[PDB]
Amino acid sequence: GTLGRAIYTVGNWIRGTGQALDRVGSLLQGSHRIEEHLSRHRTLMNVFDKSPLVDKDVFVAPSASVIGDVQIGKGSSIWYGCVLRGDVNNISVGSGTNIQDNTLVHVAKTNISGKVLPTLIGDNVTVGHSAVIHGCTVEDDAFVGMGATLLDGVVVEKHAMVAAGSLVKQNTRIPSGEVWGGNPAKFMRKLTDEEIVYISQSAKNYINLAQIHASENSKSFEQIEVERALRKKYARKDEDYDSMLGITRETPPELILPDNVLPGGKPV
Amino acid sequence: GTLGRAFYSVGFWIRETGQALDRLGCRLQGKNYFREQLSRHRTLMNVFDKAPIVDKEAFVAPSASVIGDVHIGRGSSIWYGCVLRGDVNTVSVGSGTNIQDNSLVHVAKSNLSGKVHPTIIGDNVTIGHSAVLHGCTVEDETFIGMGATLLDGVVVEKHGMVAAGALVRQNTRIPSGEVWGGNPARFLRKLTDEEIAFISQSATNYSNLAQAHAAENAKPLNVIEFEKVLRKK
């Protein structure tokens, strides 16, 4: 009513005074600080004339920049800080894959060696923690080492785990079941059955791991207020007072992680 | 100067008091949007009088984090995710070079283990992806490998290709027009003429692609997405 209008007016006066005082304070600094702008980053954007073909079931991190003509399959996800810089040739990404944090996948400009082929990514394959992909042609059911630098012409087949930190050189093809690693190609060991099962289990598990990140990074601000209020409200419990009041404080359904991301299943 | 620092701190005090007054007025009116979790990132972070200088035609990525007093020339590209950072000393970037994706330039932020060496970047210098050039001076017309790990005291003279994944050690000089790779870096071979020509064309091609990105990078921010994210259910 009238009191509400008066309080709105005095709030507007206070806001204007605060803006003027903030401007004066910034002026006193000598304009040596760069003021913050809203957002110049786009999570995925066209390069010349074509937009990426991202599937509906894909988790793309807002930090990640999947630019240009990049095709992403079902269930596959892009993690934080990962750059899919595809500007000259398509980047076909399989289904259920995961290009992990700080990872780069880039395509040569069709003439790095003369017969350049586009960077093709298989399905059910993992890249792993900021690896380097430049013209690679990874197929299904493979593991790439952490920080690996698979260069142009590298054709890694199925069950072709690459040791972390490897530097596979130009036009190198690894047979299935090898653990080639080190700064050179430098074959180390053979992929055992249990290690293959471990690779498959990791590839399958990160698929259901990405769903919580998808449902969290996409939350609206109004949902975030409720989420923070609930999280702070139920941070700690007290059996004494709750029992005395005859009530039990259960965690809200919005505060329940799915059982598939637990350390192995702890419903209780 | 100390006199400038006092004014800068008083500016902090007055600015935060003004923002607190604005928050009190806004909250008193019955609206809470200051509580938002907007990513408070700037691509041109500055400290005291160390504000960065970027040429008008230079391309800087939105995700690029240029911190300090980095000088950037005309036509040189500042690509996605690069962490150009000069605080204890300046970072010199020439004209027409290309700091590629997921790179970073150190100045040895600490003080121990000797003085800090500024980083010089020449013209038409091709910097590979995942570069961690660490207080090393590199002049024009050279190539840096894919994932090289150059340390301080490294002077790479003209046409000095570096192999991918090299671990060039401290106080190591790379002679003209030759590759230097391995762990640790070891001499591989001599650079041929066609590779020098490839070096020459690569900088121009990457720069042209950089302005191709930059022309459409300053576009209006597609207000339809902004309207969509507001009405999210």
Partner: peptide
């Protein structure tokens, strides 16, 4: 965007203003 619409918080704000004015008057009148 003209009225606060929260008739409960408004009473708190006016009470705080009255408290500040009363404290000032107490300091001056006494």
């Amino acid at each position: 965007p003209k009225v606060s619409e929260d008739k409960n918080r408004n009473y708190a704000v006016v009470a705080g203003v009255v408290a500040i004015v009363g404290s000032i008057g107490w300091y001056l009148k006494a």
